[PDB]
Amino acid sequence: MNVRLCYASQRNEKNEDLLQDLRDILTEARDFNDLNGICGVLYYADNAFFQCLEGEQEVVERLFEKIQKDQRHYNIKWLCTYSIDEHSFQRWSMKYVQRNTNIETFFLNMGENTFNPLLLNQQNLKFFLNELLIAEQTKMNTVKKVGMVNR
Ligand SMILES: Cc1cc2nc3c(=O)[nH]c(=O)nc-3n(C[C@H](O)[C@H](O)[C@H](O)COP(=O)(O)O)c2cc1C
């Protein structure tokens, strides 16, 4: 049973070094996800995250349980889990997308004046996931593998 799981979270503003945290998150995500057959997308803007995970239900659920404990974010808002009809984010172990004009236009047109994904509801994910799929990935210059960031 392949599923898609989506959540939004607040970035832990206590962590001053955002750039190192984002590079560390993507290094860890891409290595673990590639090994465990998970793909998806991570959006960051306005001190908040949106993530979608795709893959085998048990692995996705165990990964989400781990992410919920991560020091780097808090106030996790679980949006949905559902059986996948197509593997939309197959191309990325973990795609990274930041604020772009299409996403800013989406938020403003529905009456939000911030781009914080905690403001999204499940119906918005129709348009928002499509925007994350078509967005140019944001390049972040991450070390080649997770072993390089520890010991
Ligand atoms: C916003 C956010 C997204 C994350 N996404 C992933 C992910 O997709 N895959 C992954 O393995 N870890 C992800 N992590 C990292 C995990 O929370 C955790 O640091 C990593 O799995 C290492 O766990 P360990 O302490 O058991 O080695 C994410 C963390 C944050 C804050």
mmCIF file of C-alpha atoms and ligand atoms in Angstrom:
data_model
loop_
_atom_site.group_PDB
_atom_site.id
_atom_site.type_symbol
_atom_site.label_atom_id
_atom_site.label_comp_id
_atom_site.label_asym_id
_atom_site.label_seq_id
_atom_site.Cartn_x
_atom_site.Cartn_y
_atom_site.Cartn_z
ATOM 1 C CA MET A 1 0.000 0.000 0.000
ATOM 2 C CA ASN A 2 1.737 3.180 -1.275
ATOM 3 C CA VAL A 3 0.596 6.348 0.467
ATOM 4 C CA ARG A 4 1.157 10.093 0.352
ATOM 5 C CA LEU A 5 1.429 11.830 3.789
ATOM 6 C CA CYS A 6 1.396 15.659 4.036
ATOM 7 C CA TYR A 7 2.043 17.879 7.062
ATOM 8 C CA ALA A 8 3.037 21.421 7.857
ATOM 9 C CA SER A 9 5.236 22.619 10.777
ATOM 10 C CA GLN A 10 6.771 25.778 12.307
ATOM 11 C CA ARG A 11 10.541 26.081 11.988
ATOM 12 C CA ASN A 12 12.263 26.179 15.444
ATOM 13 C CA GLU A 13 13.208 29.901 15.529
ATOM 14 C CA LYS A 14 15.568 29.146 18.487
ATOM 15 C CA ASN A 15 18.020 27.719 15.840
ATOM 16 C CA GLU A 16 19.804 30.888 14.493
ATOM 17 C CA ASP A 17 21.671 28.931 11.736
ATOM 18 C CA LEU A 18 18.750 28.244 9.301
ATOM 19 C CA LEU A 19 21.071 27.670 6.284
ATOM 20 C CA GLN A 20 22.955 24.820 8.021
ATOM 21 C CA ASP A 21 19.629 23.306 9.269
ATOM 22 C CA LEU A 22 18.082 23.280 5.739
ATOM 23 C CA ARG A 23 21.293 21.786 4.204
ATOM 24 C CA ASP A 24 21.431 19.160 7.049
ATOM 25 C CA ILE A 25 17.704 18.246 6.665
ATOM 26 C CA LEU A 26 18.063 17.717 2.845
ATOM 27 C CA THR A 27 21.347 15.751 3.232
ATOM 28 C CA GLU A 28 19.659 13.413 5.826
ATOM 29 C CA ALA A 29 16.316 13.170 3.906
ATOM 30 C CA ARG A 30 17.866 12.392 0.506
ATOM 31 C CA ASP A 31 20.176 9.599 1.881
ATOM 32 C CA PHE A 32 17.496 7.932 4.144
ATOM 33 C CA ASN A 33 14.664 8.288 1.568
ATOM 34 C CA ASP A 34 16.747 6.853 -1.345
ATOM 35 C CA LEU A 35 17.624 3.795 0.855
ATOM 36 C CA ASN A 36 14.024 3.268 2.068
ATOM 37 C CA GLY A 37 12.129 3.941 -1.215
ATOM 38 C CA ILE A 38 10.571 7.253 -0.144
ATOM 39 C CA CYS A 39 10.207 10.326 -2.383
ATOM 40 C CA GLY A 40 8.529 13.714 -1.853
ATOM 41 C CA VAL A 41 8.951 17.437 -1.526
ATOM 42 C CA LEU A 42 9.930 19.883 1.253
ATOM 43 C CA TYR A 43 8.735 23.502 0.942
ATOM 44 C CA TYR A 44 10.208 26.147 3.259
ATOM 45 C CA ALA A 45 9.001 29.751 3.599
ATOM 46 C CA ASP A 46 8.180 32.310 6.301
ATOM 47 C CA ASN A 47 9.748 30.180 9.164
ATOM 48 C CA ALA A 48 7.576 27.123 8.313
ATOM 49 C CA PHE A 49 7.682 23.821 6.387
ATOM 50 C CA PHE A 50 5.304 21.789 4.278
ATOM 51 C CA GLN A 51 6.347 18.233 3.456
ATOM 52 C CA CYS A 52 4.830 15.437 1.377
ATOM 53 C CA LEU A 53 6.222 11.858 1.773
ATOM 54 C CA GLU A 54 5.380 9.087 -0.777
ATOM 55 C CA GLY A 55 6.043 5.324 -0.379
ATOM 56 C CA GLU A 56 5.104 2.108 1.486
ATOM 57 C CA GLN A 57 2.626 2.951 4.303
ATOM 58 C CA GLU A 58 4.695 1.342 7.160
ATOM 59 C CA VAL A 59 7.976 3.105 6.141
ATOM 60 C CA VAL A 60 6.272 6.511 5.566
ATOM 61 C CA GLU A 61 4.456 6.236 8.961
ATOM 62 C CA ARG A 62 7.679 5.234 10.834
ATOM 63 C CA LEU A 63 9.557 8.116 9.064
ATOM 64 C CA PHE A 64 6.787 10.640 10.017
ATOM 65 C CA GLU A 65 6.990 9.418 13.738
ATOM 66 C CA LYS A 66 10.769 10.210 13.620
ATOM 67 C CA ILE A 67 10.260 13.628 11.893
ATOM 68 C CA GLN A 68 7.675 14.624 14.554
ATOM 69 C CA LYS A 69 10.501 14.448 17.220
ATOM 70 C CA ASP A 70 13.043 16.524 15.175
ATOM 71 C CA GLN A 71 14.467 19.516 17.232
ATOM 72 C CA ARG A 72 14.453 21.723 14.043
ATOM 73 C CA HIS A 73 10.629 22.175 13.885
ATOM 74 C CA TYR A 74 7.542 22.092 16.207
ATOM 75 C CA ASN A 75 3.733 22.607 16.090
ATOM 76 C CA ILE A 76 3.397 19.749 13.511
ATOM 77 C CA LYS A 77 -0.022 19.919 11.706
ATOM 78 C CA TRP A 78 -0.803 16.526 10.063
ATOM 79 C CA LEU A 79 -2.927 17.331 6.977
ATOM 80 C CA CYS A 80 -3.675 13.944 5.410
ATOM 81 C CA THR A 81 -2.565 10.448 4.516
ATOM 82 C CA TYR A 82 -4.051 8.665 1.474
ATOM 83 C CA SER A 83 -3.487 5.782 -0.972
ATOM 84 C CA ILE A 84 -1.448 7.101 -3.995
ATOM 85 C CA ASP A 85 -2.952 6.899 -7.561
ATOM 86 C CA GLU A 86 0.292 8.136 -9.253
ATOM 87 C CA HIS A 87 3.846 8.561 -7.789
ATOM 88 C CA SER A 88 3.892 12.400 -8.356
ATOM 89 C CA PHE A 89 7.307 13.032 -6.682
ATOM 90 C CA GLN A 90 9.058 9.799 -7.940
ATOM 91 C CA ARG A 91 11.776 12.065 -9.556
ATOM 92 C CA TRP A 92 13.084 13.215 -6.069
ATOM 93 C CA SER A 93 14.208 11.424 -2.872
ATOM 94 C CA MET A 94 13.344 14.854 -1.408
ATOM 95 C CA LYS A 95 12.685 17.834 -3.725
ATOM 96 C CA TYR A 96 13.346 21.248 -2.174
ATOM 97 C CA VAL A 97 11.119 24.231 -3.123
ATOM 98 C CA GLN A 98 11.161 27.763 -1.644
ATOM 99 C CA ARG A 99 8.780 30.740 -2.168
ATOM 100 C CA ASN A 100 8.364 31.660 -5.875
ATOM 101 C CA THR A 101 5.928 34.063 -7.592
ATOM 102 C CA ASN A 102 3.407 31.279 -8.548
ATOM 103 C CA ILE A 103 3.146 30.208 -4.834
ATOM 104 C CA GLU A 104 2.987 33.830 -3.628
ATOM 105 C CA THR A 105 0.157 34.436 -6.204
ATOM 106 C CA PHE A 106 -1.728 31.314 -4.937
ATOM 107 C CA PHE A 107 -1.606 32.494 -1.290
ATOM 108 C CA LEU A 108 -2.514 36.143 -2.074
ATOM 109 C CA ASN A 109 -5.403 35.181 -4.433
ATOM 110 C CA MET A 110 -7.088 33.156 -1.642
ATOM 111 C CA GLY A 111 -6.621 36.032 0.862
ATOM 112 C CA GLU A 112 -3.478 35.031 2.850
ATOM 113 C CA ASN A 113 -0.856 37.764 3.410
ATOM 114 C CA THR A 114 1.869 35.260 4.540
ATOM 115 C CA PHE A 115 3.220 32.179 2.697
ATOM 116 C CA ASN A 116 3.244 29.988 5.828
ATOM 117 C CA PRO A 117 1.924 26.548 4.820
ATOM 118 C CA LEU A 118 0.268 26.083 8.270
ATOM 119 C CA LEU A 119 -2.503 28.307 6.667
ATOM 120 C CA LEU A 120 -3.270 25.547 4.040
ATOM 121 C CA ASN A 121 -6.313 23.185 4.312
ATOM 122 C CA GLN A 122 -6.607 19.725 2.647
ATOM 123 C CA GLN A 123 -8.598 21.172 -0.331
ATOM 124 C CA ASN A 124 -5.705 23.622 -1.101
ATOM 125 C CA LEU A 125 -3.338 20.591 -1.663
ATOM 126 C CA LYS A 126 -4.928 20.042 -5.142
ATOM 127 C CA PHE A 127 -3.273 23.334 -6.322
ATOM 128 C CA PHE A 128 -0.359 23.462 -3.799
ATOM 129 C CA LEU A 129 1.077 19.990 -4.583
ATOM 130 C CA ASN A 130 0.782 20.810 -8.331
ATOM 131 C CA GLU A 131 2.728 24.102 -7.728
ATOM 132 C CA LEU A 132 5.415 22.107 -5.805
ATOM 133 C CA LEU A 133 5.605 19.532 -8.664
ATOM 134 C CA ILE A 134 6.016 22.205 -11.445
ATOM 135 C CA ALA A 135 8.359 24.540 -9.412
ATOM 136 C CA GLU A 136 12.098 24.597 -10.365
ATOM 137 C CA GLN A 137 13.897 22.822 -7.456
ATOM 138 C CA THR A 138 15.864 25.266 -5.198
ATOM 139 C CA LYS A 139 19.559 24.139 -5.309
ATOM 140 C CA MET A 140 21.195 24.189 -1.805
ATOM 141 C CA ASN A 141 24.813 22.798 -2.206
ATOM 142 C CA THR A 142 24.484 19.862 0.234
ATOM 143 C CA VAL A 143 27.458 17.578 1.122
ATOM 144 C CA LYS A 144 27.485 14.415 -1.152
ATOM 145 C CA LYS A 145 26.229 11.998 1.666
ATOM 146 C CA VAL A 146 24.962 11.942 5.305
ATOM 147 C CA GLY A 147 28.151 10.263 6.736
ATOM 148 C CA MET A 148 29.982 13.556 5.956
ATOM 149 C CA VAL A 149 27.975 15.555 8.585
ATOM 150 C CA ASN A 150 28.700 13.276 11.665
ATOM 151 C CA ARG A 151 31.419 11.545 13.840
HETATM 152 C C1 LIG B 1 11.148 19.460 8.095
HETATM 153 C C2 LIG B 1 11.907 18.178 8.241
HETATM 154 C C3 LIG B 1 11.820 17.259 7.210
HETATM 155 C C4 LIG B 1 12.505 16.067 7.279
HETATM 156 N N1 LIG B 1 12.351 15.196 6.250
HETATM 157 C C5 LIG B 1 13.001 14.052 6.291
HETATM 158 C C6 LIG B 1 12.851 13.015 5.278
HETATM 159 O O1 LIG B 1 12.083 13.212 4.339
HETATM 160 N N2 LIG B 1 13.578 11.894 5.407
HETATM 161 C C7 LIG B 1 14.450 11.701 6.420
HETATM 162 O O2 LIG B 1 15.076 10.598 6.523
HETATM 163 N N3 LIG B 1 14.591 12.590 7.418
HETATM 164 C C8 LIG B 1 13.924 13.751 7.380
HETATM 165 N N4 LIG B 1 14.139 14.659 8.397
HETATM 166 C C9 LIG B 1 15.127 14.304 9.471
HETATM 167 C C10 LIG B 1 14.636 13.392 10.572
HETATM 168 O O3 LIG B 1 13.791 14.151 11.452
HETATM 169 C C11 LIG B 1 15.878 12.873 11.344
HETATM 170 O O4 LIG B 1 16.795 13.931 11.643
HETATM 171 C C12 LIG B 1 16.711 11.886 10.552
HETATM 172 O O5 LIG B 1 15.870 10.808 10.082
HETATM 173 C C13 LIG B 1 17.829 11.282 11.438
HETATM 174 O O6 LIG B 1 17.325 10.527 12.561
HETATM 175 P P1 LIG B 1 18.293 9.704 13.611
HETATM 176 O O7 LIG B 1 18.511 10.705 14.731
HETATM 177 O O8 LIG B 1 17.422 8.508 13.956
HETATM 178 O O9 LIG B 1 19.577 9.358 12.879
HETATM 179 C C14 LIG B 1 13.416 15.846 8.398
HETATM 180 C C15 LIG B 1 13.534 16.780 9.420
HETATM 181 C C16 LIG B 1 12.851 17.983 9.355
HETATM 182 C C17 LIG B 1 12.944 19.058 10.428
#
